[PDB]
């Protein structure tokens, strides 16, 4: 029922999900001049060498690549995090034009797209329990700008023609998510929420400072996806982003000066 259109988009979500107007909603604008460098923050540990990707799915909102999270194979540790967070899936948000598509903004700047790598805290045993905890989830957010092609994204782009419509899935084994990371792990962090229903307020956000570059041809292939199911009127999957939400009583911390 929820989506990104005039009649079902972000301004409507609070009716089914009242936490949409909560105290720790995401995304937010990252004001680089009010974010506090926190020298007590540790380096982030991204340990993706043993990652086991499974499937790629058009879920009617985005496309997602799912991972085996039955063991510590692809984990995030350190930075602002206590303990070990397992990678469950990644997905993207993107625009109809190159000047919009990101959910987070940086000094009000919107990027062409944003990659979200979703992780859950292993002390809660499964993602369904983790979703109910204020420290249950950690999302690593990476901005996309249009420039040079990202070679590590091409295997994703090339399969999207096989998952054009809602509910379509395909095998997507042996994908290495290390190929989606920028050089630097410098980040901003703040407590927030999922940016899609159910908008659960259990996410530690880690947003990397350095965007990755993707080619115009790569992002054009995202924009050929459909929100609709096979047989329904064709509605291009574009502008599947939630805008910035009130910061309220929150501090954004930076890992870098
Ligand atoms: N745009 S965002 O903030 O990164 N949204 C991510 C939303 N997806 C998920 N968050 O955390 N588990 C997620 C996910 N991926 O397949 N499955 C999932 C599993 C169980 C549940 F009860 C719910 Br609700 C979602
Ligand atoms: Zn997301």
In short:
It is classed as lyase/lyase inhibitor. The entry lists the keywords human carbonic anhydrase IX mimic, metalloenzyme, Epacadostat, metal binding protein, LYASE-LYASE INHIBITOR complex. The protein is mainly beta.
User: Could you describe the largest sheet, including whether it forms a barrel?
Assistant: 13 strands, mixed
Distance between the termini: 43 Å
Sketch the topology as an H/E string, one letter per element.
Answer: EEEEEEEEEHEHEEEEHE
Bound molecules: the ligand NS(=O)(=O)NCCNc1nonc1/C(=N/O)Nc1ccc(F)c(Br)c1, zinc ion
PDB class: lyase/lyase inhibitor
Keywords: human carbonic anhydrase IX mimic, metalloenzyme, Epacadostat, metal binding protein, LYASE-LYASE INHIBITOR complex
Assembly: monomeric
Entry title: Human carbonic anhydrase IX mimic with Epacadostat bound
């Amino acid at each position: 029922h929820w989506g990104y259109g005039k009649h079902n988009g972000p301004e409507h979500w609070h009716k089914d999900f009242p936490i949409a107007k909560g105290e720790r909603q995401s995304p937010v604008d990252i004001d680089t001049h009010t974010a506090k460098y926190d020298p007590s923050l540790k380096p982030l540990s991204v340990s993706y060498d043993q990652a086991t990707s499974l499937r790629i799915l058009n879920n009617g909102h985005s496309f997602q690549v799912t991972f085996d999270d039955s063991q510590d194979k692809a984990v995030l540790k350190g930075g602002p995090l206590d303990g070990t967070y397992r990678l469950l899936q990644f997905h993207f948000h993107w625009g109809s034009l190159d000047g919009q598509g990101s959910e987070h903004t940086v000094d009000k700047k919107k990027y062409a797209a944003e990659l979200h790598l979703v992780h859950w805290n292993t002390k809660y045993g499964d993602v369904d329990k983790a979703l109910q905890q204020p420290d249950g989830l950690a999302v690593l957010g990476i901005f996309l700008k249009v420039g040079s092609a990202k070679p590590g994204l091409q295997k994703v782009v090339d399969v999207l023609d096989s998952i054009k419509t809602e509910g379509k899935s395909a095998d997507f084994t042996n994908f290495d998510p290390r190929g989606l990371l920028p050089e630097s792990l410098d980040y901003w962090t703040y407590p927030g929420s999922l940016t899609t229903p159910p908008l659960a307020e259990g996410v530690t956000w880690i947003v990397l400072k350095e965007p990755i570059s993707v080619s115009s041809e790569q992002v054009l292939k995202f924009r050929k996806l459909n929100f609709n199911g096979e047989g329904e009127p064709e509605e291009l999957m574009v502008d599947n982003w939630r805008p910035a939400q009130p910061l309220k009583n929150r501090q954004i911390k930076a890992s870098f000066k």
